[PDB]
């Protein structure tokens, strides 16, 4: 179809990035729809590796036009960095990029806030990558934030500006006793970017109407994923934006009924940075292999990611809530050598039932255990394979069972971080 | 189509309640997947009249199984208070109706904080409904709120509770200079209604999902409006929830691609409760007549509301943003005995420009400028008639413009409060 998502079915790292490079060669646009700079994709072309984090992960492509739509939190600071080293190395970011004058912005005393918040949480604390991006949806929801669009009047915006960090200032000093955030250099740094970020505006709900009714290829790009789900992810221990399907549409202005195809991309095991339930988290030796093998490390913050099982029980959660038409399975190669490799397929919960669905809010998670289906592993190496024939049995197996238990086909398979390292089953754009 | 959703295509108080009791008689489920008790719909059958707020508007039928998403923010307060006042006119509140373990909490330091902020505002407030929607949205996103599934622990919510509260309570005091809420009060006053809240609780995520593969008919009951939305509405002077279509997803866990049907309510005329911009607000004998005619006062507030000439400008973004497959002309026996009728066909921009989009941020609004294209009015009584030839040609046409103006057709005419008082020429349901 011509309208192709692209999200995270698992808890946020499951190689989006790459996938939406991939696919965007035949698109005329790609869409972020949530989130902000805490997102961090990777690209890698001919082993030249970009990471991206606020900007959309067609940026590499002449022929797309990249779209940070209404629902993601802007830093101007973030988006000026990327812009630079993006342009340094000969891509023009300021001519493929447009971005939503709805868009909150995130400034400083976000991320001041998000720090003090993290750490009188204690011990408890989410885990959150100290970006600010709670603290401006916030903002965004008490409709007392900034937004792109009030950087068109600059004395207004100082006026504004003036007004809510006098407000979280208050708080920061005299209830967290943090350090406050200056409002000049706030004024100051915001200023110095204005006509740069003013000029890449554009009304992207009215646009991506127009390339609906013209048939153009769209591609919207989702950050994090479905488990972190403001709503439907293991709360609190989640994202404030919705990674689910639904965000697409309040997060760009594209009209729900316009989705023709959801692409959950789906990594070959589990991972997880931050707090929050896992229940197929793997603390021994497996999890130190998938971690190593996998180079689990964010690349927003560098720290070390959670590994565990993959988990159909979670992934059938992202399955309903995405109304998912294929999977893009990635990482595969990653399981190479082996001796077995294990698929939840059902929850043992604490009063001894055994279920086939997942608990919402986090508390709920407390103790329940995973109820594994081992299979054969595989010697053979998968990396960079292009075609199924490539693949030994038991990864074609590994494969076939994932799509039984889900109910949903595994249209993509990744064998590499490079964009060719892939095979297509069925494409979005075709399905 | 099996999935339908009902909302409103301008700001709010277009008749959505009467149209969902109305549609709901073949229906299984009736979800709200947004908003709080700020929504006030008004059900009139034989004469005899129901408002709710928060309970979904097909709690009169004994077939259809009432659901408040997730999406939507649950005062225990609000919800015993109807469910009294239904129960005792009859109808088995309990019985009915299901609600989401995810809704987060809307208790007394919500209302503290938006009467603080609107009082914070000076002239530049709101004008919110004061049922602390807003900070009860900002608690959920900043992640730090309580939800239906805590009441699962008396214990650890009472934890949860002091801390959230004692929270609040330093900013209430030493920021606001207002009334502390007591601690145990709140935790008295919901302590005492847990077991029938947690009663209802259901998967409403898997619970929908199951209706869509068995193909139950499902009806999404929208609160508030359009132009009211957090993200896309003429924000700051919006609610805090997507009003859009894309918040069906988001607030039930309903995957976008199961959307089959968007009808988008719209009135003969425009309201507008609270503050904001509002090109076509009339404030002539027109205006006068439009209020008292179509009484208009806020079914939660009493609050008069602003009253205006039909917008297609603002009602072509209503269609983009919600993808509308037809609409519901509401009030039309309002406008009867009117010499002429206006609808805005575009806006003159402060700098001369004639558009036919509209701005987004309230600010952008400021010196637009309605052109109007005046047709005859009728002096015929269109008051209770169901079916066409019972309307005058004038009505009629007033009909066929703005089908033409939007391009999208109008699929039922609502002629009076009375579920009957209506003429439907195309059912959702089979479209
Ligand atoms: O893009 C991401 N990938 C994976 N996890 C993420 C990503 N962004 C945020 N998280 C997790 O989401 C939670 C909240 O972080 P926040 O998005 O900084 O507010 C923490 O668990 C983060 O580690
Ligand atoms: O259900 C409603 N109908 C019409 N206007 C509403 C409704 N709920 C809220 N509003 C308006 O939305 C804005 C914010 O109010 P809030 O929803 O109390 O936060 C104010 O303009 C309200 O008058
Ligand atoms: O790619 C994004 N990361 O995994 C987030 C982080 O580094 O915390
Ligand atoms: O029906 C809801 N109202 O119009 C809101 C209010 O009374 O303010
Ligand atoms: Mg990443
Ligand atoms: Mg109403």
Redesign the pocket.
Known sequence: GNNVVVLGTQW??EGKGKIVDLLTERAKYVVRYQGGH?????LVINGEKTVL?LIPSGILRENVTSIIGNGVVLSPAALMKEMKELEDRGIPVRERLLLSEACPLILDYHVALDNAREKARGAKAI?T?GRGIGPAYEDKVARRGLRVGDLFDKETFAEKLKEVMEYHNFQLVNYYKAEAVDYQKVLDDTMAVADILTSMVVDVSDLLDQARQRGDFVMFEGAQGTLLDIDHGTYPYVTSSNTTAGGVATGSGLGPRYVDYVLGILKAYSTR??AGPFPTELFDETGEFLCKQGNE???????R?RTGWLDTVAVRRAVQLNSLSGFCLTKLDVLDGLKEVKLCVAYRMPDGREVTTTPLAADDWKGVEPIYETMPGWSESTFGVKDRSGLPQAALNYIKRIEELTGVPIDIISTGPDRTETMILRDPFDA
């Open positions: 946020g790292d805490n997102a961090g994709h990777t984090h885990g990558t940075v931050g490390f964010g690349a927003t913050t560098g720290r990611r």
